[PDB]
Amino acid sequence: GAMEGILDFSNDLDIALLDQVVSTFYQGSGVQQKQAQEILTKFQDNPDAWQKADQILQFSTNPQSKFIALSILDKLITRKWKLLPNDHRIGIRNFVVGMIISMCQDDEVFKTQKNLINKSDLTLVQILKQEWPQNWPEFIPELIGSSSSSVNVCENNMIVLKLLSEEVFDFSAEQMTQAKALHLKNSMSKEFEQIFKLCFQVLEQGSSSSLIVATLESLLRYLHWIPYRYIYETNILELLSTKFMTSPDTRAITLKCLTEVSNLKIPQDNDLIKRQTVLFFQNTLQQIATSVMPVTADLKATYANANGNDQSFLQDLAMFLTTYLARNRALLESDESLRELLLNAHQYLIQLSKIEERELFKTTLDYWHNLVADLFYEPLKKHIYEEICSQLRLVIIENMVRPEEVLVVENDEGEIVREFVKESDTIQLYKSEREVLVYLTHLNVIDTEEIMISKLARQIDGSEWSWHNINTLSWAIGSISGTMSEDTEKRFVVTVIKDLLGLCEQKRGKDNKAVVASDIMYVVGQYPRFLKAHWNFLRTVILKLFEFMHETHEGVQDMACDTFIKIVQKCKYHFVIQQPRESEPFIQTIIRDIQKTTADLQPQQVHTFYKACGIIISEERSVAERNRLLSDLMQLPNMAWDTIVEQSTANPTLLLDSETVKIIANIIKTNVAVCTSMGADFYPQLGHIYYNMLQLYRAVSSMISAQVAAEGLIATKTPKVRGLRTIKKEILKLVETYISKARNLDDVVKVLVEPLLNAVLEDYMNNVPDARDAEVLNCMTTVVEKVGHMIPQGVILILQSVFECTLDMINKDFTEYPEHRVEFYKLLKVINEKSFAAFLELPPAAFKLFVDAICWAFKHNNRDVEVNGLQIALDLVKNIERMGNVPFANEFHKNYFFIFVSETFFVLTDSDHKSGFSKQALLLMKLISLVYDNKISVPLYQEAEVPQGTSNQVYLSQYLANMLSNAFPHLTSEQIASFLSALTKQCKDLVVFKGTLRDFLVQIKEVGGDPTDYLFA
Template identity: 50%
Template sequence: MKQERILISKLNLILVQVLKQEWPKNWPTFVSELVSSSRTSISLCENNMAILKLLSEEVFDYSAEQMTTVKAKNLKSQLCGEFAEVFQLCTEVLEKAQKPSLISSTLEALLRFLKWIPLGYIFETALIENLKSRFLTVPLFRNVTLKCLTEISALTIGSEYDNKFVALFQSVMDSLSLMIQYSQDLDLAKAYQNSSDEEQKLIQNLSLFFATCLGNHLKVLETHVNREVLLLAHMYLLKISLVDDREVFKVCLEYWTKLVSDLYNEYPFVAMESSGLFLGSIAHTNSRRALYGDVLSSLRLVMIERMVKPEEVLIVEDENGEIVRESIKETDTITLYKSMREVLVFLTHLDYEDTENIMTEKLSRQFDGSEWSWNNLNKLCWAIGSISGAMNEEVEKGFLVNIIRDLLGLTEMKRGKDNKAVVASNIMYIVGQYPRFLKAHWKFLKTVINKLFEFMHELHEGVQDMACDTFIKISKKCRRHFVVLQVGSTTPFVDEILAKLPSIICDLQPSQVHTFYEAIGYMIQSQTDTTLQGAEISQLMSLPNGSWDTVISAAAQNVEILKSTETLKSLSNILRSNVRACESIGPAFSVQMSRIYMDMLSLYRAVSGIISDSVAHQGVIATKTPVVRAMRAVKKDVLRLVEVFISKVEDPQAVAQSFIPPLFDAILGDYSRNVEQARDAEVLSVTAATINKLTIHMEDKILPILSAVFECTLNMINKDFAEYPEHRVNFFKLLSVINSHCFTALLRLPPMQFKLIVDSILWSIKHTHRDISDTGLNMLLQLLQNMSQADPSVSSTFYRDYFLNLLQDIFYVLTDTDHKAGFKFQSAILANMFQAVSSGSIPSPIFDTSKHPNMDNQTYLKSHMLNLLSNAFPHLQRTQIETFVCGLFDLNQDLTTFKAHLRDFLISLKEFAGDNQELYLEEQELEQERKRKADMEAAMKIPGLVKPIDRPDDLSD
């Protein structure tokens, strides 16, 4: 076994695959043979345990993706029915065996069984006593035994087994206390990094045991276990929570989230608020909250000291101890922050006074130097920012005023640019998290904004970015407060900002200026007086408009100026400022768009002409030169601005009549005439966006659009699946929106051009890029649905010419392992097609009647499918194929049943073996979306649980 371990492992895997096909029908004595052979040899017994473990995994863990529904059900039933023999063997081994590897192998097998065997096997036999004795007395098996005890804790246990479960918990606590007290096997106070691998694994497994046991059975333990023992378990988990291992911490965090949310939900904040009380005042009157009072206070400290960085914070300490701008977002850290934030919000609800006292005390230690460090200050401020909305408004006001005052004092007290950058970063993060407070305290809001303007002149890496990001966040949430006249002011604050705009943004980088323009745009968008709004837009855009007019005027005199990279960069930045302002201002941006629109199209034509001349003289290599690339950037920025503006319009008909003709005149011909390398994919994107927004008002423009872009783009992308990726994505999006909104225009195409459209759709569904294949499948489904509503004279021709080819291509991608992710659309298309035939809604034959006279569509299609599948999969039995084909006709009314039927067929194909998880992608995505909505709905009811920036109901009043 030692020498040939790898070979034996492979043979075990093969045996289990054979069993999945042959057992129990062709090998009914397998289990009894395995058990009997185990009693003849220790080595055989050890390996048989490995086989049983594998079999359990295959049947109970992975069967959904590897076996048909019926087969999986039968094997589960068989394994459960014959488990008594297996369990008896496991019990004998645990009671009598001496060889460590055999005992370990048996425990590992049992670990897999515990998920599905009846509770009687666990609680009415000597199994638990065996496990407990191994845990208590044999350090070698402590980890695997603890895993088994954790698996038992994960089960739903009926009240008849409460006492036995409590005894199990008590035994683990007793043995743990002994280990900590009398031995070196486990010392939770010892630095985790200095422990051995086994000790580290034990701490990891203990975190799982406590989190699972307490998380699933806390109410039972509260009723039956001594109070000191229960609190000791929580204190152990608190110590483990301080272990410097993120995965261990995540396990602990999952339990803490459950505990604090359960304690909160017993007396929710909302109920207390309506009676005029605040939740914190009853923290000590409720017995369960009082029971965990010390645990919760310690947990607050743990959460603050382990707090991770929110995504809004851009300034970090690098490995050299220097303060720099963050370069990469860590998704794991962002996810962890959200979970920690949730725990802190609940902890604040459970006792806001304790939370406030701990945070205030820790901030005072930053001043006296006893805890001063960038890391400590960051974690504290991240925690402070995370509890926004969890206190009532009056309490929050006092708390926040003191915090910000102290932090501003810390800015003055600390010397050095790095120190000041760290404190500034934390101030900006905190104020950005408290829009409710800012909206209620105008003078403070104005002070904060002016402080952000100061930070916009601070050249330390990351500070300006955070200042701009915080400014836009506050602008979104408090937008209305900037455009109304506040008490004590002579003009709205937005006017003050606009008047000082050049001096505010003078030190910002172009990308930061763009963010600034978007932020001001949110303020202007909330202006209700349209005359004032127009004036504010003109004032906001006066700086870029001045630069724009200068360049456009100079270009009119001498087009050569457009060959300067500096000029082109300036134009790009002007256009990008317009894009960001348009995104936030919305439809009212038409004032600015009308001013620059025709000049913008003239600029587009001018740079297009220079690019064409450059290519004519230098060849395709010209497209790689810096000047031409800068010109193409300007063209892309023009198209992006047009696309954003069109997405905001409120009068589609007027825009279609006045705005679109000059646009298409400028961009479509240019796209068609250009060499491949100089065609901009954004032309396809803006055209698709225009059709998507203006819908039926674009019907008369579909033929000219297709004439200009269809064939020339198709020739770029039909050579392979890799070249021109942006063009191919946008090309199929364009076809998709035409199909969705202007279907009648497609029907007016000449037959050959319509065939090209259908061929393009079929080509896209075979694409290996998921977005493209999904777009193609969705397009095909929409085409079939549209055809079912079309005039019979049109649909009859379509079904006769295309139905069977479409069906064959859909079955091609359905049975191709590279296209499993498209199963959602593939199954919907097939259901649609078979339903159309079985219901008789296709009025004319889909086949050549001269070859098959006196045959209807349903009879023909059944015969056709039997032949098609028999030829494609000769290894399948005829009865299998017949059953599958009958199901295609009988089950297409219910899409869920139809999909299950398709899945079973696919899994039965040997060629389709492997990871079939993507066949369940739709259900998984739907479940994730359902859960996301339910979680959001529940979280919205708890003050502070949803970040202010994410609350849809928290826009400026």
């Protein structure tokens, strides 16, 4: 339509039309808005659009059009500025400066066009980065001068200076070369006396103007870097800590300034500077107490009400108090006249710690950890904070969040359900709360116990009964395990368990009993020491866990199984032995009762139960009894297995039954589960099922293939095939699990490996892509990892079966077959480490695909793949180097050296693989250092492309000069030459080499980068 006219540059720019396009974009909607967007984007990206900028700034009626004109200039200034001749640069400088000035002097524009003015100031700062001070030495003096004649211009110059400080000190590390950041920092530093003088005058001569706020905002940035004498040897501290704290206009920014002041680099030896550090805190706390709120104020309620800026203010107060006190509280701890100030400041933090706001609570909790850790180790300090610590115990006990183990939760309807998702944030918060509360318990174990016991009493009588309150208490009780004496722990733990069991019987309905059960289970699972010494309780605990396995809430059942695991991995010894007063080892009675204990458990909970029994059985070290205990445990799965093995080999038609595959799946999951906890001790049970299991694997494989043939690829999605594949995956999981923990490696090679490979490898190779299980590759990785060195032919065979076919699945795009991708490079990683000989036996065309596969991995943004790709390249180069001066290594370097060098350079420089920078750099360093140390014995150049005598060093430089010249044609030969000179000299010094690479990445995004930047180191 009409709007596309602005893209035709042969005509003059219709400014009114531009403004319609802009207001259509910003103020419009739907198809018209999106149409305007595409046009505006194309206009902005037109490489001559900057020539229209002056015209837009003069003639447009739309502030957003002028914003966009500056964006266009910004892009030119930061990227192509140094191609422009002097006249254009000076010209653009002049109308940016002139526009800022004229916008500031029209008082209505200064009020109404803040966005446009700030954008002009930023654009000016981009010009300063290119031009100042080398080609604009007068800027700071002229800025200082022009501030005196207009308060709007003065205020706006504080913004310019703020932005300048930010760009030079806060955001230079990524965006400028090391040399240029150093040059601009030095330049700002030399001119700062004059900048501070102007800043200080403005603060003395004014109360709470918009000028004062802008000046203080500028000071906040200066405090990141300025020498401390500007803060301590002037009156600025007194002004910040008194005058600018009273006025609410200046308060927020002042408080941030004072927070940064609390982190300035200061003398430790000087008694006067210490007094000034104390004084500004004294002043600030005074202003807060008298102007904002007293120490007793309910900040929880204030924050909840959310009037004006109260939330941001309380956040900033928290940051100020914690920052200051973590660094300087020792200054307040000895002098008795400073005690009230110390304790009021901490009392403020106590009040802030009651606020209902997770992120703020984490902020204060970090400080409390810092405090209580110090009080735990520093002599004669804890008595000062006794009343603070006592209040803190209450706060933490009443605000405990749910630990990882507690599987029952309270939803929005008000019902108790099993948790849908793990809450990793709240798990971490629980742990941070535990650390603090553990320290607090050591600091006064009597106080902590009394608080907890009386809170429990008010859950018994029902005067404070709630789900929230029984939960927080029980979680707190569990969290402090290990803090009390064995005797104190005995009486405490028995008291709370007895009292919680009393609650579990009293309360009505299935919701309340799920809550109390989860709390009982959390507590007992946290106190294994107590349960070890008191078998009476341990046994009752366990049969109570077995009682919870029959409840209708699945969360209660799940938690019983996990608590059983948790108790068992600490108390296993007390099950393995026949104790006094007992007919038998408790293990053996558990085993025979399994049928009925686990009757109402669902399969996954049953498998956890069996894994727990596996943990117990593995405590028994006499080989005979363990092998038997294993036999006893596995009888129900082995009998199901023995009756299902005979039916499926008497007729392969019964395995069609979907109910039968489910039983088979669960039999193997039970074996996996037990093998997980028993490891090398599982061998007898594995050897019982191994040959028949691998025949079943083949039987299941045939039917999957037949179903795909008859039904098509869509068969892989069906419940039946997914069930059959589950059997294959679980079989693979069992063999992988065993071999990972195996302690008879001769038995693995001689018994397990050959049948495994015959059963799985050709089945994988000869299935269609969608039928191949990634778990095959995972399984082989462990095989190669543990026994690769003992089976060189077996590893060759693994490669032949999986390498070319898996590569073909994963080399069309970066997305398809994600788990194959990941397991593939894990496999090649381990083969390249442990059995590199296998790659030496690949034919030359297949070895070429190995190199292609490695470089393909570099280009992934998937970090599972990327990291393994770069590691393989690095290990490969190292493997080749170890062979020495032999034909394979000489051939490798001629065929592939420059392929690795240029592929590494490509990912380093394309801006789409920044996450692997460190590994890319290390790899590039290794490759360059091979030539620099003459470890390549042959010429890398082809015969008669350079003179005969010339070294690989000289040729490497010319190759790379040429490569970079063509890939980055906007670089001068000089930039390229200096970069490569620096890079080659720094190839033993990783951190410097990386700095030089980073400098190069800055220089390729602009024109006219200084070649001497590469002499920085």
